[model samples]
Target: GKLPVPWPTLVTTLVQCFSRYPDHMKRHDFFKSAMPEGYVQERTISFKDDGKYKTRAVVKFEGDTLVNRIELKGTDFKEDGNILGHKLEYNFNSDNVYITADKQKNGIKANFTVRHNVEDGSVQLADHYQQNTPIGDGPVLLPDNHYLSTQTVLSKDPNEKRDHMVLLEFVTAAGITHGMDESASQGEELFTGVVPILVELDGDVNGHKFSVRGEGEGDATIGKLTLKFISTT
Candidate 1:
């Protein structure tokens, strides 16, 4: 009859780190936008041009109501001073989720009634399109396509717990290749390459409490890397 509880909420004190990407900017200023501390905003996620990047995110649950509603209104990443932004509206309980946002790629309006599929490793992205389905309206998952996740490989070891995922379309053009894109004994095509490049790291000691780790061509310009193991406590 009613939405289930105890609902979990999300808050991140480590947002400025996400804005450290070089030549990156959200259509709206995602982390800086105003809200009740940790709901939504733009100060949104928009980036520009080509570059190298590594990011870490920790999802922790606060024994509180996550968020039932949000309003986003702001503009950034645009050269023009005029405000080029829209107000996105969304609300959800345990019943049906509703989301509405601009579709710049098609310059049209859209919405959906999405839900989880228990059949396989798949998700129902939309139900059906209605001619009258108002602009910026739907209940679905947003697949922020950056072409980072192009390929994946599974572990042959029976003891392996989870799968290994990495970006297939890497920015390294003439970098070195170790086991990434190499042959494995179990006939599992696997690969993970690295480039010795400097990266901006602005860890949020107050954000989600995480452990970070990284690798690259190290001392003498060879194979090297760094990692920070953050905790979600």
Candidate 2:
């Protein structure tokens, strides 16, 4: 089968959001060697699981790497008796990846550090290596590594199947705890301090319809985090 012409574009967008491979000079510029001055791009995502939440993704190419910062905000939501107003930031580049969730549950404040290797709650970084298997190349998802991969497949028609899919499978740090402060009760451990998050995104190319789904347990108190894709902008 002939590979779709748009395959590279779709993969580029995914890497802009989730991976740092775009940091390579040619990939970063899509043309020249110089990084554009003050170049920043924004991407938007709506939730398919619930309408209350949305995300704003801001990305830029540094001379050294690509930086992506996402802000997820929600209001008028409740978890049990907790009336929640939360703001979360999922930020990453080639060298670092981290998450900060600011949650107000029932008017009580609790800010969590999901994973910050540069500061606190360190987890081994993801590694890419060649394997002898028929698959050729893939990430090495080791116990001590943070790994994620995005793949896209070309389909003959949109009505038949999706053109792109992204999957991220990785383990979090074991000793990290979430709380208003690390000194506060150690909060609740994120999936009992060691857990894997499985994130999958599938979408069509013509209309740009996509939905993201993630299944995992994190910080027992703040509740489950739901990820879905409504559209991209």
For this target, which candidate reaches the highest TM-score against the unseen true structure?
2
* lDDT of candidate 2 at residue 228, scale 0 to 100: 20
Q: What is the C-alpha RMSD of each candidate to the true structure, in Å?
A: 20.3, 21.0
* Model 2 per-residue lDDT tens digits across residues 94-170: 22222222121111111111221222333312121111111112121111112222222222333423333232322
What lDDT score belongs to each candidate, Candidate 1 first?
0.19, 0.24
Evaluated against the true structure, the overall lDDT of model 2 is 0.24
How many pairs collide in each candidate, listed in order?
35, 2
Q: Given candidate 1, what's the lDDT at residue 212? A: 20
lDDT of 1 by residue, 159-186 (tens): 5232211111111111112243321111
RMSD, candidate 1, Å = 20.3
- Segments of candidate 1 deviating more than 4 angstroms: 1-149, 152-206, 217-233
Error of 2 at 200 (Å): 21
Q: Best candidate per lDDT, number?
A: 2
